[PDB]
């Protein structure tokens, strides 16, 4: 899907830790989203840091430059 391709493109712009956070959050890698707590344990990040990673990633995904109209 075009969503898939754009999602991987966006993930490539992130640091390794940020991309891992996003993949665990949305369950992109193995199909299981993880709770904020487990993501924090795995990557040593705060709930707030996860939220800002997710906000930036969503902004990149929804930006009209990448839009699937």
């Amino acid at each position: 899907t075009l969503l898939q391709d754009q999602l991987q493109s966006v993930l490539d712009t992130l640091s390794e830790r940020e991309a891992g956070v996003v993949r665990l959050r949305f369950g992109l890698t193995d199909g299981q989203p993880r709770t904020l707590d487990e993501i924090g344990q795995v990557y040593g990040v705060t709930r707030e840091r996860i939220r800002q990673i997710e906000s930036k990633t969503m902004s990149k995904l929804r930006h009209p430059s990448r839009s699937q109209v």
């Binding site: 493109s9 712009t13 902004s59 990149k60 009209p64 430059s65």
Partner: peptide
């Protein structure tokens, strides 16, 4: 911007 590098906007 559909014809630009998307990372330009970030």
């Amino acid at each position: 911007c559909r014809d630009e590098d998307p990372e330009l906007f970030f």
